[PDB]
Amino acid sequence: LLELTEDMEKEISNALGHGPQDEILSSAFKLRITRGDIQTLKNYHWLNDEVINFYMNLLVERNKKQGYPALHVFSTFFYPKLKSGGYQAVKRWTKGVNLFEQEIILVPIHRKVHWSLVVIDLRKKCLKYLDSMGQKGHRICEILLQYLQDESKTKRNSDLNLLEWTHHSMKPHEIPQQLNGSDSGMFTCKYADYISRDKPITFTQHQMPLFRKKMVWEILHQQLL
Amino acid sequence: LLELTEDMEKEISNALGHGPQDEILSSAFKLRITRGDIQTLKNYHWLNDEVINFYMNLLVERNKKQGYPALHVFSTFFYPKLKSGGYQAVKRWTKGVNLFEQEIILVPIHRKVHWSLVVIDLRKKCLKYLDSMGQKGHRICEILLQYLQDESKTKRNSDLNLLEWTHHSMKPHEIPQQLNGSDSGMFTCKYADYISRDKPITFTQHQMPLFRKKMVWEILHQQLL
Amino acid sequence: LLELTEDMEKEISNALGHGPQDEILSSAFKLRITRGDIQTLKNYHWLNDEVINFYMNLLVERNKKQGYPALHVFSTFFYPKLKSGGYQAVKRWTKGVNLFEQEIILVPIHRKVHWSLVVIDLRKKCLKYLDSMGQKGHRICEILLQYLQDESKTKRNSDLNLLEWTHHSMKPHEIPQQLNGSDSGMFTCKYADYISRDKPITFTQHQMPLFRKKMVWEILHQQLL
Amino acid sequence: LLELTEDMEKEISNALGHGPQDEILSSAFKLRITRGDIQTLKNYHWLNDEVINFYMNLLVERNKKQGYPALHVFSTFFYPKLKSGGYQAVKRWTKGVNLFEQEIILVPIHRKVHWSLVVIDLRKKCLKYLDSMGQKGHRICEILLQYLQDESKTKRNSDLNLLEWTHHSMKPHEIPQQLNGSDSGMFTCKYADYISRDKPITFTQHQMPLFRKKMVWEILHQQLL
Amino acid sequence: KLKVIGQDSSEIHFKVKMTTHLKKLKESYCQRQGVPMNSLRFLFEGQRIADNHTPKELGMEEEDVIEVYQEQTGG
Amino acid sequence: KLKVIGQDSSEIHFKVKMTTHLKKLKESYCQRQGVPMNSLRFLFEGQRIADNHTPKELGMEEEDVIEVYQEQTGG
Amino acid sequence: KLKVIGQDSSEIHFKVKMTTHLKKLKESYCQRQGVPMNSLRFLFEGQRIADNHTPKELGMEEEDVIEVYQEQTGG
Amino acid sequence: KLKVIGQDSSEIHFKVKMTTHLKKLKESYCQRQGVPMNSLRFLFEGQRIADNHTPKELGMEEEDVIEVYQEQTGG
Amino acid sequence: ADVSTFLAFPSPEKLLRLGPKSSVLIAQQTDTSDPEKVVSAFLKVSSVFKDEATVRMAVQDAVDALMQKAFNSSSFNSNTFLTRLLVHMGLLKSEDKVKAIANLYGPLMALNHMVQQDYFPKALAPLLLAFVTKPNSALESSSFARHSLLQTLYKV
Amino acid sequence: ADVSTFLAFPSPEKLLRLGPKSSVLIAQQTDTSDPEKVVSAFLKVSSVFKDEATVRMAVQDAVDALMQKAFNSSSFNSNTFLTRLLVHMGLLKSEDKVKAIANLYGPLMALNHMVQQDYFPKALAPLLLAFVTKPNSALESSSFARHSLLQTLYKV
Amino acid sequence: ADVSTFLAFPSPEKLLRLGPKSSVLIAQQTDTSDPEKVVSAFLKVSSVFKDEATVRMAVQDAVDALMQKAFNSSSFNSNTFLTRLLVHMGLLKSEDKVKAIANLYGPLMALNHMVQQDYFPKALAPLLLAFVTKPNSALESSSFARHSLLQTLYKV
Amino acid sequence: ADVSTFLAFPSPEKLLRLGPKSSVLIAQQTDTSDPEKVVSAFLKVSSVFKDEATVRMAVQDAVDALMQKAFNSSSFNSNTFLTRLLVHMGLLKSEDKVKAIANLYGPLMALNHMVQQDYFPKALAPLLLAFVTKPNSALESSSFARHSLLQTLYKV
Secondary structure, eight states: OOOOOHHHHHTTHHHHSSSOSSOOOEEETTEEEOHHHHHTTSTTOOOOSHHHHHHHHHHHHHTTTTTOSOEEEOOTTTHHHHHHHTTGGGGGGSOSOOGGGOSEEEEEEEETTEEEEEEEETTTTEEEEEOTTOOOOHHHHHHHHHHHHHHHHTTTSOOOOSTTOEEEEOOTTTSOOOSSSSTHHHHHHHHHHHHTTTOOOOOOGGGHHHHHHHHHHHHHHOOOO | OOOOOHHHHHTTHHHHSSSOSSOOOEEETTEEEOHHHHHTTSTTOOOOSHHHHHHHHHHHHHTTTTTOSOEEEOOTTTHHHHHHHTTGGGGGGSOSOOGGGOSEEEEEEEETTEEEEEEEETTTTEEEEEOTTOOOOHHHHHHHHHHHHHHHHTTTSOOOOSTTOEEEEOOTTTSOOOSSSSTHHHHHHHHHHHHTTTOOOOOOGGGHHHHHHHHHHHHHHOOOO | OOOOOHHHHHTTHHHHSSSOSSOOOEEETTEEEOHHHHHTTSTTOOOOSHHHHHHHHHHHHHTTTTTOSOEEEOOTTTHHHHHHHTTGGGGGGSOSOOGGGOSEEEEEEEETTEEEEEEEETTTTEEEEEOTTOOOOHHHHHHHHHHHHHHHHTTTSOOOOSTTOEEEEOOTTTSOOOSSSSTHHHHHHHHHHHHTTTOOOOOOGGGHHHHHHHHHHHHHHOOOO | OOOOOHHHHHTTHHHHSSSOSSOOOEEETTEEEOHHHHHTTSTTOOOOSHHHHHHHHHHHHHTTTTTOSOEEEOOTTTHHHHHHHTTGGGGGGSOSOOGGGOSEEEEEEEETTEEEEEEEETTTTEEEEEOTTOOOOHHHHHHHHHHHHHHHHTTTSOOOOSTTOEEEEOOTTTSOOOSSSSTHHHHHHHHHHHHTTTOOOOOOGGGHHHHHHHHHHHHHHOOOO | OEEOOOSSOOOOOBOOOBTBOSHHHHHHHGGGSSSOSTTEEEEETTEEOOSSOOHHHHTOOSSEEOOEEEOOOOO | OEEOOOSSOOOOOBOOOBTBOSHHHHHHHGGGSSSOSTTEEEEETTEEOOSSOOHHHHTOOSSEEOOEEEOOOOO | OEEOOOSSOOOOOBOOOBTBOSHHHHHHHGGGSSSOSTTEEEEETTEEOOSSOOHHHHTOOSSEEOOEEEOOOOO | OEEOOOSSOOOOOBOOOBTBOSHHHHHHHGGGSSSOSTTEEEEETTEEOOSSOOHHHHTOOSSEEOOEEEOOOOO | OOHHHHHHSOOHHHHHTTGGGHHHHHHHTSOOSSHHHHHHHHHHHHTTOOSSHHHHHHHHHHHHHHHHHHHSOTTOOHHHHHHHHHHHTTSSSSSOHHHHHHHHHHHHHHHHHHHHSTTSOTTHHHHHHHHSSSHHHHOOSHHHHHHHHHHHHTTO | OOHHHHHHSOOHHHHHTTGGGHHHHHHHTSOOSSHHHHHHHHHHHHTTOOSSHHHHHHHHHHHHHHHHHHHSOTTOOHHHHHHHHHHHTTSSSSSOHHHHHHHHHHHHHHHHHHHHSTTSOTTHHHHHHHHSSSHHHHOOSHHHHHHHHHHHHTTO | OOHHHHHHSOOHHHHHTTGGGHHHHHHHTSOOSSHHHHHHHHHHHHTTOOSSHHHHHHHHHHHHHHHHHHHSOTTOOHHHHHHHHHHHTTSSSSSOHHHHHHHHHHHHHHHHHHHHSTTSOTTHHHHHHHHSSSHHHHOOSHHHHHHHHHHHHTTO | OOHHHHHHSOOHHHHHTTGGGHHHHHHHTSOOSSHHHHHHHHHHHHTTOOSSHHHHHHHHHHHHHHHHHHHSOTTOOHHHHHHHHHHHTTSSSSSOHHHHHHHHHHHHHHHHHHHHSTTSOTTHHHHHHHHSSSHHHHOOSHHHHHHHHHHHHTTO
């Protein structure tokens, strides 16, 4: 396994410690992660939307610099908009790219106080809804799918047979669950750090704290470790 | 002033006292006011949506049986729908009636935990937003107005000049304000019981408790007193 | 009745307002009433022991400068000591005075969080236990009496016939009771300001707040009004 | 080490489970340990005075049936009485026995919400104050000693040289401390179960829960294990 | 043939013949939901579809939408 | 003839003949008090007077003192 | 000429020339609101319009919509 | 030579000459205690020994007892 | 003689072994001239409660007896009763809260600060936290009674 | 001799009239071999706090002195210190909460019931309510300290 | 067909008009393969509770049926069930408390200060106070549930 | 133009880089005709607070400016201001507490019972307990603000 870098540990506390709540600590993807933002990684705090729209983006780059499946990431402010704005109100969203060209698509999910994650593995022709709180989500996939079908039969006139398509919720006994009401943020990113690498979710709770730290580091340097 | 009927007081406690939470206690307008419902009138409780969609309807009848201005009442589940569904999604709503035929239009309002009231006095050609919590509401009127304009130039092709139209929020020093976080329900109905009768809001807090009781009575008998 | 002195009202807020918590604001009887001390008179605060060992002393002087019954006051730290130290451990306490020479004897009382008052009217040959909390106190009198009997048959060899002596608890319907859990301090002093003057307890709750203020004033100047 | 008896474990839950709160579950030494009493051994509950006046007595018998130092146990209601009643008020207490005949004397201690333990090792001619809360206790020993001196020079006219006598508080780094605000009861008994057997306190917190159970058992059967 | 779009999107396509009660269509819907009926109320083009109400007294059009809203409370 | 001084002072002078139970003398005392018996325990010169105990098995002296103490709890 | 529809409806019609920063258009909007900027984030057709960003590096069409969303948090 | 028995037992034997202030004897005592002076008050045979007070204006007897009590509060 | 025995030291079964007659039995054997004997009683009776209808109802019906007989009589100060009951439940009095708080302010301002300083041994925070997480520092007694009481007072 | 005087009976000004030197002055004049003298000190110093930077900062900087000098020494049991501090703040111990609650259950089950019965004099509810609304029955002391302490512990 | 009807919209009497058979009736008519349908059920059944043994016991005995049948089966994740139940009771999640507090700190530091300044209109304090004394600002919901739950957890 | 910039998005330093003039600078640049712009301001200013005199005092003195200018003018409804401020602090409104509680009663009566039954898997209690012990289920937000506010209101 891994162990922490005594000097880079103290370098984290400068990002999470006292100081300005706006002093940008990292930039990229058009997202500026400030103190306030990166602070959401503290023990028991709730990850905001940037600590995610970012890590979720480093996952793409790490999968193009270590060569993993074509990975198409969507923003936190995506599903919601779609949930109420159909496809018409999301058309111009997929600009400069054929979605079906990709292998895997990661879609973060915001239910008011919760972080879920839908993995649309384009290859195997189906999507999986992973939730670290047990909560189920059928209508979520059912809806998302309906985005594709139109993201196709409207953005390429070529329809989509729904038969060859499947979706399903990953049961609590399959993937690891959280044991508190704060960490669901991480559980969603790390679900991607693995699902993205086609690797099996073998991680758990008595490790998350750490995951949190490296994560702030990972984002400082923008180097996924 | 008024005083309570010793025998009809005890008749209220049978509607508000123990017993089934479904035992319908009054019917009309297609709304069935049950124990659970009418219970929301208890001291300090928060009025639900039926205790209102009803009293707000008795106000119409009382203004056709005591002869007051043509009064058009709208449902609690109206503005919300409109707030997100434009006019198109509200067209078939005004069925069997020319809105502009009316003199005054009462529109209840639900901001998550709050009860507001917009009075659209069709006669004087303007609408007033009355809030017993001080909270302001400009974008509310601005939007509602935009319902009319289309409820006209679309349901009668005859446009609507916005110049002859006005709207404004009734300041806290004008109308009575509430002194707790429970009674805003009543403050909205009683704002109508008066505004409807073209009468001045002279009522206040050290009276509301009562207003609550008579209100359950008023609804039992469906006789507005 | 009485009304407050606009200028002397603001003079109170200098005694109760911010500033040092030791800046002595009055001296006499060998008791130094500091800020901290006099502060205990604030709304809802609990009177300490000096705010009492004092006012209870101004009562003696006011009854020698306005000529009232011979008044012998005892200290708050008296009964307790007696409750456990018999008479032997209280002998030298009554120094320079024949107790039975007096007409009335005021005895403050401290039950852990409570202020009671025993009035030993030497004249009528009996003592009364006045409590503003309803709480009863028979064993209290029974004990105190037993102090006298020995304060006599030991400090003058002349015994004491207990028959001619009586004591009784003043019922809740007789004297005024308090309606909170803070003011019992005053209720005990004011019980003396009157009982001392042989006057009937006609005061009540919707007045105590005031009593509190004048009391700080009364103590500032040491002039009982 | 030891392990639990599956059948005798369930026999404990009949003593600690539901049922009457008076159904005596053990008798001896003139102490009747009822449900209510033995219940005080539940997780996080505070041991009462009988759960102790008893276990503290089984310690004597276990040290006469397994042959350990002459052990003289004192009752919980002892020190207090002494703290205020000098020796005179404790004379007739040591009835039918020469205290100095004994080797070790165990003295439980009740500071309002706390359980302390003074061990008076008569042999080595000194006493030790053991507290599992860190709290110190010099005036305690100093006083207790003063009981002996008189328990001698008054109950045998033979004085006592205080020079050959010593007492001292056992520092927090010496003996094990508790990590909560409930278990100090046990910490005092187990301090005796060992100190009595001249054995070193090697036990700690991550074991106390258990100690609690066996203790209810130990008392059921009156067999110290 | 009908629909019952809720305060969200959930399209639970239904079907019945225009004559008999809607109360049966009520319990039916409130069956597969996370919170009971009296937490919901059924509206059709605005008017609130009572229980005593019938598609026959409503003049509803097959393949129509019977929206549903959740209770409201303010204070 | 006896006494039962409590944890305070309260002298409740008693009387009975040395032979029969003290359990009767227990309920008796705990009768006129603000908190029941099991909140109290009876001690005589130290030893804790059980119920099965009798003034006859105790060797108590008339006009003696049977002190009483209130439960203790620590943690 | 522009627009900045929020997470609701509020159409605050704007206007500026395509060249200079949008940061000025940021503070501008967040001026007449009940909660600051860092509680909001500006998106244009999806991509999140940074501050260093310019309508000139964006290729925005006059009379276009620059939606705005409020922070999200989950745990 | 003196003593200062507190509200408990603690005999802290003292000594000084009858002339100078007792205020010095105050701070002195309140020195080795768990709660300050103004939480305590010094009484001698009843009368409350002020600071301006002196053993010379008190007529105290060497090897005498100057008891001390803790503040009281009720409400 | 069966009421007095029970009162001496109550018991779930002690009340149940008085049958249906125990209700008014206790109520009548309790003088309501003085609000104290009444409370004194109100307390011994309810002191028996335990989750088990048998006992629950008994107590209720029991209490109702005592309280009706109680209210229906001039010789009754329902203010003191009430009062005196709250003090026994420690819902009233118990501590000079005003002062108690006033003392913490300081140590509290300090103690927090402390934990936040760099010199605070990282191995400590956890202990501290784990320390005020234990039931004797978490479980609130009267501050709980009080809320329950309010809920009902507000009717729901 | 200026430290000892202040310690005897602290005062905002008593600390301020020791200038910038009072910080380490107090800290060094306090033996940290035993965790008690330390707490004993930690308390007298903070017992002075009052909303006013002058005093605030003084105390802080002051405390920091005592606590660093404190932590930096083997002869220190930072568990007992901590412990012993919580007990003085009554955040620990103070009452057999477990039991305290266990007693209310009954009277509480009763008292509520009572208020709800028809025989309960309508004029009473209001009194009762108004009674547990007063500050001595509303203001929570340690149950407050404790929360504040947690907030910081959880870093925000 | 009588279970399903009741479940649609529960009622005290709706459960009681199923006699003694309703207990295992509901329990068996509820698939425990997935922890949700179970909670979904656990909730509808208890949603009926009201102080009245008839209903109380019914629900209890009822719940016991569902929960035993539930626990006795591998296809059951008693962690998620538990979990998922706490979230519905809003004992879990509900608000970013960490942040919520973090925001108040400021306004709170301010608002207090304000009230304390001389320019604060004396006629206001009373209003403010009277304002946060009202039941909608006093009555705590889940912060109450939670305590009750703890009490039992700690066995007494 | 320096006030407006700061207001857009406040910052500790953003306020400090306005020197001693920022106090009345902000206060005067804020119209008090309507109680909302005032609160709107009161909030942005205090939203900056952080334990550090520099910032503390700034904010205070700042607030005082705005509030005096505010109170001294007929065009001001200090009731609504007050009101409207409490709602933003969620000390008012926020949830139909009355109802929220009313729902728990059932699930709460149930959930406890459950834990107490023999069929309850011993390995669960611990989880449950450990579950409501976590900060997101322990930390109270407004139910905290509110207490602090009361303490001051009661003057100590």
